[PDB]
Structures are given as C-alpha cells and as structure tokens.
C-alpha cells in the first residue's frame, strides 16, 4: 500500500477516463451504433433525440454489465473491506471479469492482427492477453458486430420500401415518391410487431 495522497491523485485521475472506459471497455459502442443505424433505417434522422438514444444505450449497458459488476463486487468491492486482498492486486482481480468479458466478445482475427502489430510472439495462452492488444481488437470486433446487427435491422425496412415502390410502379404511378407512402407503413410495422422490445431482447442475447 502506497501513500493516501497518491491514492487520491490516482483515483481522481482515473475518474477522467470514465467515457473511455464506457466506450472502449464496455459494450456501449455496439448499442449506440445499432441505435444510429436503426434510426437511419426508418428514414427519420431526428425522430428520437440523440439524448434519449444515449440514455437508452446507457441503461442497456448497465443491465448487460450487471453480471460483470457483480463479479467485480465479489472479487474487489468486498475483499477490499475485509483486507484479505487490497490495492493494485485487488484492482487487477476486479479488472479480471472485464477481461473475461472482452475475451468472450472479441474475435480471434483482431487479436492476431494487434499482436503482430506489437511483435508479441510468445503470446501462447488465451487468458494472458495484454490490455494493449485486447482493447483495440475488442473495439474493432464491436464495430463489426454492430454493423452486422444494423444490416439485419436494415433488411425488413429495405424489403418494405422495395415492396411499396414496386406496387406503386405496378399500379401505374411513375412520379409518386415511395418514401412518403412507405414511412407510416414502416412505423406501423415497427410498432405492431413491437420491434423495440424484441430488439433489446436480441441485443441482451447478443451479449
């Protein structure tokens, strides 16, 4: 254990990187990109405010991190009080669930690329991946996953738009823009199937 004043300095300094922790280490990027792509899908880039989407992504991130938060509480929050383990060793033990999660959600190709970017040859085991190699690989994997989910969301709305345009063309209309007609049908399909709750359920299942 080192000095209390140094501990305060380090704690307040690490408090600054909270957006970095939320974005790079948790899943927040995935939900935020999925929400952005879904908003782009419905054809209305300002229908729900950016604030509301950010808060919804924050709540989803909190739930989906609740198991990792519980593991942190068991391994770090509690034993730091009983003083069986404390300080930097307890900090590393508490960060261990974050690795496990980020190893689970990271693809092998990104980790391989970032290892050969750091000349880390003897990285043989999969539970001893350094943070420098694990973090950007995890972010890239999250970007790929979010884009895939966005395309899957895109498919039904694209189908509806194409169907509306095809019926307009077949009915004889050649000048009517299909977007105006298809927008309320997109909304009625989204509400009627209750798209939002199934979307959140799938995102939670998507881990």
């Amino acid at each position: 254990s080192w000095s209390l004043s140094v501990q305060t300095l380090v704690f307040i300094t690490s408090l600054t990187f909270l957006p970095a922790i939320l974005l790079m280490m948790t899943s927040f990027t995935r939900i935020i990109i999925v929400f952005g792509l879904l908003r782009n899908a419905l054809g209305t880039p300002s229908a729900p405010p950016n604030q509301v989407l950010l808060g919804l992504a924050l709540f989803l991130t909190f739930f989906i991190m609740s198991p990792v938060i519980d593991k942190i509480y068991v391994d770090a929050y509690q034993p730091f009080s009983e003083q069986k383990i404390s300080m930097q060793e307890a900090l590393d033990k508490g960060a261990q669930p974050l690795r496990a999660f980020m190893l689970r959600q990271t693809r092998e190709a990104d980790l391989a690329l970032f290892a050969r970017l750091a000349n880390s040859g003897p990285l043989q085991g999969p539970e001893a991946v350094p943070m420098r190699i694990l973090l950007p690989a995890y972010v890239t994997s999250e970007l790929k996953t979010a884009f895939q989910i966005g395309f899957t969301i895109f498919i039904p709305f694209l189908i509806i738009d194409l169907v509306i345009a095809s019926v307009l063309m077949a009915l004889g209309m050649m000048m009517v823009p299909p977007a105006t007609i298809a927008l309320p049908f997109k909304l009625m399909l989204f509400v009627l199937v209750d798209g939002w709750q199934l979307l959140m359920g799938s995102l939670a299942q998507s881990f």
Binding site: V52, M175, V176, I181, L183, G195, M200
Partner: protein
C-alpha cells in the same frame, strides 16, 4: 462547548444534495441550459436544506469506496427519474417530426440521410407546446415530490438492487414509438389518403403531376389538418404524463 461537529452536518447534507442535484441536471425544464448554473445549484441546496434534517444521517466516510457506491447510487436514481420523465417529450417530438416529414417539409433526408440539412419545425412546435402543458399541469413539482419520496422506498444507505427493472426503463423506449403513433395515427392516415388521391391523378396522363401539384396541396392540407388536431394533444399529454409517472412509481420500487 463550541463543538459544531462538522462531519455529522456534512454527511447529513451531502447525499440528499447529490440525489437532488442529479435529478436537477436531467429532469426536463429543470435541466434546460437557459437556467444559470448557480440558480440550479441554489435550488438543490435549498431543497436539501429543507429535506435533510428529517432524514436519518449516514455515517459512512467520504474517504471510502462505500462513499463512491453511494454517489453512484444517487446519480443513478436521479438520472433514471429525469430520463423516464424526458421520454414523454421524446414521444411528442417523434410524433411532430413524423407529421412534418409526411408534410414533405424536409425532403432532403430521403435522398441524403443525415446531411446537415434537416428542420423538424413541427417537432419543435409540439415539443414547446408539450413543455407549456407540462408546466401547466405542475409536473415538475410532482418530480421534486417523487424525488423526496423515493427515500422512503429506497433510503440513502446502500441497499441491494434488482435487474429487469432497468429493462423497464429501457423498455420504456417502446412507448416513445408506440404512443408516438397514437398521436400521428389520424392525421397521417388522412394524409395517406390524400397521397393515394394524388396517385389516382397520376394514373391519368403520364407525368405532369407530383412535385408540381402534390407538394403545395399536401402542405396546406397537413397545415390545416393538424391545426385542427392541436386541441387533441392535451388529453394525450395527460395520458403520456400519467403513463410515465406510474411506470416510474411501479419500477423505481
């Protein structure tokens, strides 16, 4: 004598201040940037001055991880309350933006999505109308009262927490859409019929229609339609506020 125990007063006045200020920074109308920061801070300070002496004082030291957990808890409660309240205005904004987009007011989004050219002026109109209605129905007083009341349900002291409850707030994201359609279902429908009518005109002699006759007619029709539809939002406004409030009451516990 001349004690004036400072730690007791600090611990009594801090955590209620944290929760009240966390609600203030996110609750609608109380979180608008037009208010000077010092006014918000003073309102939080005075509300805490009124409330805190009745509450049981906590004794956890500010120099402990327990204090950090407490601060996180207060921030979570405040932002959850404020955001759940904000959901109703989000729904009203959605309905207004969709009415405006079916007006053809901003056609550049269909061709250039998110191209720095968008003006949901109807969304702003009904957003500020909703804010005026919320001010009239004294929703903010209720918010403050419920912020106070969540103590009896959830005391300052660290208490265990649940899960699907968070989903509920996240699942409230559905309401913004669902209720939004409930505000746009009549007018858009008639607009739809109007567009259908325009289609019948285009089934006649080719071209020479749409983009030249459809836009002004549909713009004027949307204007007078939803001008007549304005008296309708107020019952729906109260319905939205009641939905948000009882969802908050049920799920916060």
């Amino acid at each position: 004598v001349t004690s004036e125990q400072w730690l007791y007063w600090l611990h009594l006045y801090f955590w209620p201040l944290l929760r009240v200020l966390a609600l203030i920074s996110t609750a609608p109308i109380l979180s608008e940037r037009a208010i000077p920061k010092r006014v918000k801070l003073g309102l939080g300070i005075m509300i805490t001055l009124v409330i805190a002496p009745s509450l049981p004082a906590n004794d956890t030291p500010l120099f402990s991880i327990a204090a950090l957990w407490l601060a996180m808890q207060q921030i979570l409660i405040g932002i959850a309350l404020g955001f759940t309240m904000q959901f109703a205005f989000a729904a009203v904004r959605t309905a207004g933006e969709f009415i405006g987009l079916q007006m053809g007011l901003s056609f550049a989004t269909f061709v250039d999505p998110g191209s720095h050219l968008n003006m949901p002026v109807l969304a702003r109109i009904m957003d500020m109308l909703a804010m005026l209605l919320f001010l009239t129905f004294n929703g903010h007083l209720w918010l403050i009262s419920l912020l106070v009341d969540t103590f009896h349900t959830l005391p300052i002291g660290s208490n265990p927490v649940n899960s699907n409850a968070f989903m509920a707030l996240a699942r409230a994201g559905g309401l913004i859409f669902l209720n939004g359609l409930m505000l746009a279902l009549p007018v858009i429908t008639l607009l739809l019929t109007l567009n259908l009518a325009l289609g019948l005109l285009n089934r006649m002699a080719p071209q020479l229609s749409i983009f030249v006759i459809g836009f002004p007619l549909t713009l004027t029709v949307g204007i007078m339609l939803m001008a007549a539809l304005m008296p309708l939002i107020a019952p729906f406004c109260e319905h939205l506020f009641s939905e948000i409030f009882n969802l908050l009451a049920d799920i916060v516990s």
